[PDB]
Swiss-Prot record, chain A:
This is DNA-directed RNA polymerase subunit omega. The chain holds residues 13 to 70 of 78 of the full protein. Keywords: DNA-directed RNA polymerase, Nucleotidyltransferase, Transcription, Transferase. The gene is rpoZ. It comes from Nostoc sp. (strain PCC 7120 / SAG 25.82 / UTEX 2576). Its EC number is 2.7.7.6. It is an enzyme of class 2 (transferase).
UniProtKB/Swiss-Prot annotation, chain B:
DNA-dependent RNA polymerase catalyzes the transcription of DNA into RNA using the four ribonucleoside triphosphates as substrates. This is DNA-directed RNA polymerase subunit beta'. It comes from the Bacteria. In cyanobacteria the RNAP catalytic core is composed of 2 alpha, 1 beta, 1 beta', 1 gamma and 1 omega subunit. When a sigma factor is associated with the core the holoenzyme is formed, which can initiate transcription. It comes from Nostoc sp. (strain PCC 7120 / SAG 25.82 / UTEX 2576). The lineage of its organism: Bacteria, Bacillati, Cyanobacteriota, Cyanophyceae, Nostocales. The gene is rpoC2. Belongs to the RNA polymerase beta' chain family. RpoC2 subfamily. The chain holds residues 6 to 64 of 1355 of the full protein.
Swiss-Prot record, chain C:
DNA-dependent RNA polymerase catalyzes the transcription of DNA into RNA using the four ribonucleoside triphosphates as substrates. The lineage of its organism: Bacteria, Bacillati, Cyanobacteriota, Cyanophyceae, Nostocales. Belongs to the RNA polymerase beta' chain family. RpoC1 subfamily. This is DNA-directed RNA polymerase subunit gamma. In cyanobacteria the RNAP catalytic core is composed of 2 alpha, 1 beta, 1 beta', 1 gamma and 1 omega subunit. When a sigma factor is associated with the core the holoenzyme is formed, which can initiate transcription.
Amino acid sequence: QIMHRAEDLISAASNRYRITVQVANRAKRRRYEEFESAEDAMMKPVLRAIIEMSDELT
Amino acid sequence: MIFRNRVVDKGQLRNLISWAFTHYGTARTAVMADKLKDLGFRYATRAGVSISVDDLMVP
Amino acid sequence: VIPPDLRPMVQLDGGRFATSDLNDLYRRVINRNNRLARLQEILAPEIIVRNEKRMLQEVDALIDNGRRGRTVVGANNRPLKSLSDIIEGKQGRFRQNLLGKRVDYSGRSVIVVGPKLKIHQCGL
């Protein structure tokens, strides 16, 4: 979906905040790393951040 | 996979929701009781209802 | 003594240039201080000197129009908000000017009924 099944990863991964924070940490950089308008990053920096967490979070 | 059939109420919502989220990813179930919820509407619509005057019945 | 730019003198053209309400404390206070000394020397009677020392200790008003003499009067006999009356009440700077600043970037429009949209998302 766009964002919905993401209610479990954070929910079940030790300290939630903590998660966030890293997740940003992704975020920030994993926009940052590429300022070449890579359309992968055409969408918001987080949401990727998330997801590729997500689907590595198996 | 679990049919319930009684009447509905407030509470059995209330609980209901619970028992869902209690075992289902928040959003996954938080999203529930929304389509069927807005369907509360459209039904209720269809049944439709309203006062009368002597709606104000007096025993 | 607090810096000037912050008690500042304000600008409305026309001659109604508001100024402030603690610089006038000062206004007092400096005068009560200088004029006095300017007795000393001439060493005239304490009736005009030792009596002023109270009009000098009266600087207490600067620190509080309000504890302990009758307060001094403002444009409307107000307790001229003392320098110790800026960050004191819930409406006195302090928390409301920090714990509760107003702040920018956001919206404030009437929330009329609009159940058409879903819940996890609002309608801007």
